[PDB]
Amino acid sequence: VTVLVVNSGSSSLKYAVVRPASGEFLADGIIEEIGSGAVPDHDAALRAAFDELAAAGLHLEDLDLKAVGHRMVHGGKTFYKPSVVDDELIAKARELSPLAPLHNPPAIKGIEVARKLLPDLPHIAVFDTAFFHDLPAPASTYAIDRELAETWHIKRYGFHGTSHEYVSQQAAIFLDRPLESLNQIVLHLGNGASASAVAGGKAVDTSMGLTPMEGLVMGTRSGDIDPGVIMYLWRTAGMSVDDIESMLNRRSGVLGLGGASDFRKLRELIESGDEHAKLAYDVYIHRLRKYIGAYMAVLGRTDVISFTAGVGENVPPVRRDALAGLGGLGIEIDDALNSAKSDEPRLISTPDSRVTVLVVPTNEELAIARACVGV
Amino acid sequence: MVTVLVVNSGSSSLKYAVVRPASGEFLADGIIEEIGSGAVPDHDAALRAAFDELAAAGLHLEDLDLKAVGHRMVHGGKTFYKPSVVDDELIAKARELSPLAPLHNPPAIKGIEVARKLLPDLPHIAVFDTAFFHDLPAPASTYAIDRELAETWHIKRYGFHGTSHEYVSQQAAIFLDRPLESLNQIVLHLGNGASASAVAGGKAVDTSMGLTPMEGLVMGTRSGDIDPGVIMYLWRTAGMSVDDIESMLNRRSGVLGLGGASDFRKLRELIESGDEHAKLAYDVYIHRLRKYIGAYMAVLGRTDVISFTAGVGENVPPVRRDALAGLGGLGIEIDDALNSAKSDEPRLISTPDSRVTVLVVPTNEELAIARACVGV
Numbered sequence A: 001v002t003v004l005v006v007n008s009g010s011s012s013l014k015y016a017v018v019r020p021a022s023g024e025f026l027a028d029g030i031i032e033e034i035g036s037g038a039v040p041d042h043d044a045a046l047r048a049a050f051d052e053l054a055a056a057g058l059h060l061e062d063l064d065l066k067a068v069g070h071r072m073v074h075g076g077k078t079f080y081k082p083s084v085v086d087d088e089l090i091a092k093a094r095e096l097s098p099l100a101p102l103h104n105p106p107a108i109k110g111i112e113v114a115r116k117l118l119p120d121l122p123h124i125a126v127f128d129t130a131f132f133h134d135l136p137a138p139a140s141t142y143a144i145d146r147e148l149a150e151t152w153h154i155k156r157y158g159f160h161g162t163s164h165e166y167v168s169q170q171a172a173i174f175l176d177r178p179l180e181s182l183n184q185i186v187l188h189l190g191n192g193a194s195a196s197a198v199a200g201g202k203a204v205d206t207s208m209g210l211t212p213m214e215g216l217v218m219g220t221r222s223g224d225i226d227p228g229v230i231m232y233l234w235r236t237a238g239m240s241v242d243d244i245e246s247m248l249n250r251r252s253g254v255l256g257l258g259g260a261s262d263f264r265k266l267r268e269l270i271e272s273g274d275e276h277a278k279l280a281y282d283v284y285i286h287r288l289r290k291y292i293g294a295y296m297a298v299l300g301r302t303d304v305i306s307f308t309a310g311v312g313e314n315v316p317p318v319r320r321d322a323l324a325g326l327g328g329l330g331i332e333i334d335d336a337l338n339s340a341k342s343d344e345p346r347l348i349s350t351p352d353s354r355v356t357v358l359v360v361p362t363n364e365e366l367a368i369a370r371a372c373v374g375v
Numbered sequence B: 001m002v003t004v005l006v007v008n009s010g011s012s013s014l015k016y017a018v019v020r021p022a023s024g025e026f027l028a029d030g031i032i033e034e035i036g037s038g039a040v041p042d043h044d045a046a047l048r049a050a051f052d053e054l055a056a057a058g059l060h061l062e063d064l065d066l067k068a069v070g071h072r073m074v075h076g077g078k079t080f081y082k083p084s085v086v087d088d089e090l091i092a093k094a095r096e097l098s099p100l101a102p103l104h105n106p107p108a109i110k111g112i113e114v115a116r117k118l119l120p121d122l123p124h125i126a127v128f129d130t131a132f133f134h135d136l137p138a139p140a141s142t143y144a145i146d147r148e149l150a151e152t153w154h155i156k157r158y159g160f161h162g163t164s165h166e167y168v169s170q171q172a173a174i175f176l177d178r179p180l181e182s183l184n185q186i187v188l189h190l191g192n193g194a195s196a197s198a199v200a201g202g203k204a205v206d207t208s209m210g211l212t213p214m215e216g217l218v219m220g221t222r223s224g225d226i227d228p229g230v231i232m233y234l235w236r237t238a239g240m241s242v243d244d245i246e247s248m249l250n251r252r253s254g255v256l257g258l259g260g261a262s263d264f265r266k267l268r269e270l271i272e273s274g275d276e277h278a279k280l281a282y283d284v285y286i287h288r289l290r291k292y293i294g295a296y297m298a299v300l301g302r303t304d305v306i307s308f309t310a311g312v313g314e315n316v317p318p319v320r321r322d323a324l325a326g327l328g329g330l331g332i333e334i335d336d337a338l339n340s341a342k343s344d345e346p347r348l349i350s351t352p353d354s355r356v357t358v359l360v361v362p363t364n365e366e367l368a369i370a371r372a373c374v375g376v
């Protein structure tokens, strides 16, 4: 079986052609700077991905393509399992776009162009929420008016579920220990950033909320913030609710506080003596330390902590700084291991660390491909 | 001996005490409740009623060496945090800030206003919930939002319940006969409002409430922590005004909104009767509390002591048990017998094997206010 995988984000479109059984990748790539002269919209972007495949000597028509898998961030209550795309599903994803305004809209546009180019294949949506569907009620229920919550279906959905799931599975395998025997924390530190607590393979907590706005500090998102700040910006700073949301999603996190377009730039700013960048980094780490401790308490016993996604996989100082000074919680980083140049699943804790600490790279494309099978 | 009158004016109640700060002796104490209608329509009427109770109990303030009247003020923003003699400037600032602490700043201002009419010739002193947290480290008090917008509008984590967090951290050190500066501590103020703090060698390094008392733990009627996306959704889709969302989060949330219980005693009674909603609310409350305890253990790195205080913290053994159960891996073990035995004294509730020492350390809030008035 062969699958085309599309992850259509606001600014870029990631694609791969994958054989899920073997895991082999026949091609992968990223079309960047959507809105450029060359790639002005998502429709241009998928067409360009097709040109790159062709340029590589890959012709989809000769491949056994059985499905096209898409990342969708929010499906609300109705859609969370891998689902065959139809007009119904697209209508619901559109309805829910305001719950995930940075992700659902370009995902839908990715679907729209893909269904035009490949109208006779099944298109399958794979949802970020799926892994968290069975979160325990005490972890997913906000402490608000119960009638109100249930009336509007307010609960913690959680996101990055395919990464948290994949990484928790792969950490067990790396340790050659049964998934069901392990209590784990997974730290998905990318443009979006989320933590999960996984107890014997089952998600028991995660940091994002009804929407991807809750939790860790992110690239442009605030994460956790006092609800009073929102009320004050509305009441006293005179900002509209939409403008406050926009600020929290797009002019917050490392960018808003630190001035950095992405995490590589931030670390460069810090290296150049920029105090604002250093504060934004320290705020990011302080938040991350708090989620790690919080989730150790949720689990009771913690066997494994794994770092993943762009920052988690590639920035040793984040991993060091997140875990520094936690000998009394059973955690000790091996600095030589942590600093190793490597892209492989790997150990970063010392032999005497009671908690095992890993880097376990995410593979969204493989996860989506496998989730298409059988649907 | 020097005597202080303490006024602690909340949304629907006014707590009063006449206290000797040196000995800690209370000459009188009481609470006026159900303020807002009937015989006690407002806080002016409430303090007058307090004075009637003092007289009925045989207390005559004019016979006392009353040196000051102390008032709890929750928010003074940037300008007022130290214990401060009340003047019009301070009142005007507290009034300006009232929407940041709508359950607390307005009734406290009203209490000052009547107190100054009844006792014009005494200094009235404001004691602020934020003081203990004034010097929080910037990485703990700076929200990850647009830096320039935050700076312009003075947005940062202030923290509240400071007098209790301060008092308990001091008293935990004294109880353990160890220097205050040697200890890393967590304090859990579990009352109608609820907040946690992390204290390193006497200095606060983190706390759970925010710019406002709305952030952090689950509380009596307050939500504490919530996805900002929920607020946006309630506005956009449920058609609620921002003021009404705020009111819901402050007044119809927490154990009440979720559990249908007017207070924690009632909540436990419902649970014992088999009320599934009340049980889920308790489990949400404990889940959140556990997360803050774990979080602040990571902030401190090494934690020497965890102390419970305030109404629930002092009086509800199951909360202390459930908040800390299954944490042997983090060096914590509760002694169930010590935890269950009734006492009103500062006391140990952890086993000798527990690496982290666990205490119950009661706070008398009125006593703390009276003490802060001395030497202002």
Ligand SMILES: Nc1ncnc2c1ncn2[C@@H]1O[C@H](COP(=O)(O)O)[C@@H](O)[C@H]1O
Pocket (backbone or CB within 6 Å): A189, A190, A191, A192, A219, A261, A262, A263, A264, A265, A309, A310, A311, A314, A315
């Ligand atoms: N080698 C690297 N060094 C620093 N940051 C990186 C590196 N690789 C990826 N990132 C960051 O990870 C984020 C993207 O992660 P993701 O969303 O998982 O693709 C961006 O902020 C990138 O700058």
Ligand SMILES: Nc1ncnc2c1ncn2[C@@H]1O[C@H](COP(=O)(O)O)[C@@H](O)[C@H]1O
Pocket (backbone or CB within 6 Å): B190, B191, B192, B193, B220, B262, B263, B264, B265, B266, B310, B311, B312, B315, B316
């Ligand atoms: N003995 C008790 N048993 C259960 N809850 C109590 C007890 N005493 C006080 N509380 C609760 O503590 C909360 C108020 O604490 P505070 O704000 O410190 O007065 C209320 O929910 C009370 O019902």
